[PDB]
Amino acid sequence: GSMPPQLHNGLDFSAKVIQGSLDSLPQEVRKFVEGNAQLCQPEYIHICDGSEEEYGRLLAHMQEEGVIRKLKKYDNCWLALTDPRDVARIESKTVIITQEQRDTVPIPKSGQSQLGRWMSEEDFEKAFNARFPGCMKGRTMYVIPFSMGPLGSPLAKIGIELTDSPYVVASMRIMTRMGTSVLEALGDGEFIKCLHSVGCPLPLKKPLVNNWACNPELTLIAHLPDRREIISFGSGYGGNSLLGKKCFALRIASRLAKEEGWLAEHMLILGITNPEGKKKYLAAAFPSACGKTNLAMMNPTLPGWKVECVGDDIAWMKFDAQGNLRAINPENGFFGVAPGTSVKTNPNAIKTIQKNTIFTNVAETSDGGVYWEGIDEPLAPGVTITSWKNKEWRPQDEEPCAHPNSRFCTPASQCPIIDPAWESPEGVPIEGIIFGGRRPAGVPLVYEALSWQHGVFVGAAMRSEATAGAEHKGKVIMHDPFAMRPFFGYNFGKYLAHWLSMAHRPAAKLPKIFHVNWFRKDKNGKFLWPGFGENSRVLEWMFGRIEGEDSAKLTPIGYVPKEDALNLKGLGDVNVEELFGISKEFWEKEVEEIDKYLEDQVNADLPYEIERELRALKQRISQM
Ligand SMILES: Nc1nc2c(ncn2[C@@H]2O[C@H](COP(=O)(O)OP(=O)(O)OP(=O)(O)O)[C@@H](O)[C@H]2O)c(=O)[nH]1
Numbered sequence: 235g236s237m238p239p240q241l242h243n244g245l246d247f248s249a250k251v252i253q254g255s256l257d258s259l260p261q262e263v264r265k266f267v268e269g270n271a272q273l274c275q276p277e278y279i280h281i282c283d284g285s286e287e288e289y290g291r292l293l294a295h296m297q298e299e300g301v302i303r304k305l306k307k308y309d310n311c312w313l314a315l316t317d318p319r320d321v322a323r324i325e326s327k328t329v330i331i332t333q334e335q336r337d338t339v340p341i342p343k344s345g346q347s348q349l350g351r352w353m354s355e356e357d358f359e360k361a362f363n364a365r366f367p368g369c370m371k372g373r374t375m376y377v378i379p380f381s382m383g384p385l386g387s388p389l390a391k392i393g394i395e396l397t398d399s400p401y402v403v404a405s406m407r408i409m410t411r412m413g414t415s416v417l418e419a420l421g422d423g424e425f426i427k428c429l430h431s432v433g434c435p436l437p438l439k440k441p442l443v444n445n446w447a448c449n450p451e452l453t454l455i456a457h458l459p460d461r462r463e464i465i466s467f468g469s470g471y472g473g474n475s476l477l478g479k480k481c482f483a484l485r486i487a488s489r490l491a492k493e494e495g496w497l498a499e500h501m502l503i504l505g506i507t508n509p510e511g512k513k514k515y516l517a518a519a520f521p522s523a524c525g526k527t528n529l530a531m532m533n534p535t536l537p538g539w540k541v542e543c544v545g546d547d548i549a550w551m552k553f554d555a556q557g558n559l560r561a562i563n564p565e566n567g568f569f570g571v572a573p574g575t576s577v578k579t580n581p582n583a584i585k586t587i588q589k590n591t592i593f594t595n596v597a598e599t600s601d602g603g604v605y606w607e608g609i610d611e612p613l614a615p616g617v618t619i620t621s622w623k624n625k626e627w628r629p630q631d632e633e634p635c636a637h638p639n640s641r642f643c644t645p646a647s648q649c650p651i652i653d654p655a656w657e658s659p660e661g662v663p664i665e666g667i668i669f670g671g672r673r674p675a676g677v678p679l680v681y682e683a684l685s686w687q688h689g690v691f692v693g694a695a696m697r698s699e700a701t702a703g704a705e706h707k708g709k710v711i712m713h714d715p716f717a718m719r720p721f722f723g724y725n726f727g728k729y730l731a732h733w734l735s736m737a738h739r740p741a742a743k744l745p746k747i748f749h750v751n752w753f754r755k756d757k758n759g760k761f762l763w764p765g766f767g768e769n770s771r772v773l774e775w776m777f778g779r780i781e782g783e784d785s786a787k788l789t790p791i792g793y794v795p796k797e798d799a800l801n802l803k804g805l806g807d808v809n810v811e812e813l814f815g816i817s818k819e820f821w822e823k824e825v826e827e828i829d830k831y832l833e834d835q836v837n838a839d840l841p842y843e844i845e846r847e848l849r850a851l852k853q854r855i856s857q858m
């Protein structure tokens with residue numbers, strides 16, 4: 235980029251650049267970098283190249299600074315422990331900026347929307363001015379050029395993230411394609427502008443907790459889709475700071491998708507091969523902390539079945555000229571929930587995470603390894619544990635050894651069952667789409683939608699127990715339509731209309747739509763379904779249905795498996811009565827709840843087809 239004019243020496247940041255060159259940046263990239271440097275006043279500017287040496291040195295630097303620790307039991311793995319105020323997404327501080335509120339969320343009848351948070355442009359400007367001026371004083375501003383999707387993909391989009399956090403830098407290296415090749419690929423093209431600061435300019439005004447720079451009181455994660463900007467202040471935690479992931483690849487991207495005729499979704503993408511040598515790709519939207527990563531890299535218990543992972547969290551999809559729904563994973567790594575992860579529940583993850591992996595808020599064993607709730611693996615006598623709170627911890631204490639939302643951040647290329655087409659620019663053809671969440675009562679193991687319009691309603695109607703992915707506590711059953719409640723880039727009613735419109739386009743090969751429940755419990759609080767690898771039995775049913783197998787019976791909520799259609803061999807004890815039961819009383823209550831929620835929260839933007847599906851379901855239940 236060209237040197238900016240100036241009458242003094244305060245606008246050209248060249249003298250502060252410690253890696254790279256402002257002169258060699260594309261013009262608009264330099265303007266973005268330099269304009270935000272003038273604002274944030276970093277001491278240095280480091281333009282990331284994405285090299286292993288850059289990565290190695292930056293890790294070493296955080297190490298000597300006490301910001302991360304080396305996990306010496308493994309190969310190039312590292313541990314960060316955060317300030318306990320900065321441990322997850324915060325939905326209440328996550329906002330979208332548009333001229334009119336209705337462009338961002340439907341106007342709720344009750345007056346409080348549960349489908350996003352809108353902030354006026356003028357309110358945002360004030361919030362921005364109270365945060366960012368001088369916020370990087372005494373820090374390095376890192377410039378991360380990154381690509382969502384393989385360098386080529388028709389589906390791929392480039393961002394530049396500016397951050398004062400080396401932790402963000404290292405994590406983005408794993409979770410996106412990052413560095414010099416991205417700038418070369420961008421040229422003078424368009425990019426998403428992403429600005430991040432931990433909100434702790436030097437000298438420190440507040441006491442630093444556990445060497446983790448953050449500003450909880452001022453935390454704000456903002457999205458400005460008209461400006462193509464994401465602006466995030468005060469949090470270093472993944473979902474808030476790795477701007478390509480939730481901020482770009484769901485929130486911004488879903489709005490772009492609506493405008494441009496594609497889809498951006500909170501979905502895994504997996505490839506499943508049967509004993510007859512046939513492979514199908516499926517997508518699944520479950521809410522945060524509801525099993526996507528476990529399903530995407532499942533080790534099937536059924537002989538002759540194979541599952542391969544394309545992506546575990548984000549799907550970008552578009553109908554091609556042939557009418558196939560084609561999906562790509564825009565991420566480059568897995569940012570997975572650690573606790574619960576074991577050789578038993580997710581052996582494929584256990585394999586992936588022992589090299590080149592960054593862990594956040596898990597426990598450390600005295601021999602340099604990791605520990606967490608449900609790791610289900612004994613330690614040798616004499617091995618001791620440091621909790622994620624950096625305290626000595628014993629298996630019989632008050633609190634967990636790892637944070638409930640503790641994460642691993644691991645390269646996708648490492649996964650032993652990574653799908654061979656996971657970086658194909660063409661994407662993979664999706665043949666079914668699975669919705670589901672945590673319902674301890676009433677909702678059977680699996681059912682199939684009656685039609686496209688009904689499947690879109692099933693997505694819209696999704697409810698699920700609260701999890702630790704964000705700020706929500708306890709186990710209350712919440713609405714989480716399409717697993718996208720925290721992530722809609724625009725009015726949910728319009729998003730429903732967008733999904734419905736897919737049925738109207740030329741030669742569209744619409745996928746089969748299913749709904750699952752891994753989480754139904756008996757009257758004792760015991761899970762009725764073993765889950766995990768055993769979920770291959772459900773996927774088998776879905777596979778045959780996609781092929782047109784006569785294996786379904788009609789019920790009021792959709793098609794279910796016929797008696798004996800599911801392979802339950804090796805699971806002789808399963809209470810099929812309760813697991814597959816559909817109660818009129820439960821479903822009457824359920825449909826009334828859905829009706830009130832859609833009326834209140836979607837209101838004037840609720841598409842007629844969805845209100846029709848509600849009426850029809852209500853009618854079918856009334857005839858039980
Ligand atoms: N009982 C049971 N638990 C499961 C199952 N699948 C996943 N889990 C657990 O649910 C928690 C979260 O699962 P993940 O697969 O990481 O969820 P995710 O959808 O990828 O979550 P986000 O990354 O937050 O979007 C972990 O503790 C898992 O061990 C299952 O089939 N049965």
Ligand SMILES: O=C([O-])C(=O)[O-]
Pocket residue numbers: 323473521522523547569703704
């Ligand atoms: O990080 C995630 O994947 C989430 O919170 O859903």
Ligand SMILES: [Mn+2]
Pocket residue numbers: 500522523547
């Ligand atoms: Mn997620």
Ligand SMILES: [Mn+2]
Pocket residue numbers: 526527546547569570571
């Ligand atoms: Mn996940």
Ligand code: NA
Pocket residue numbers: 300301302314315316317444445446
């Ligand atoms: Na720390």
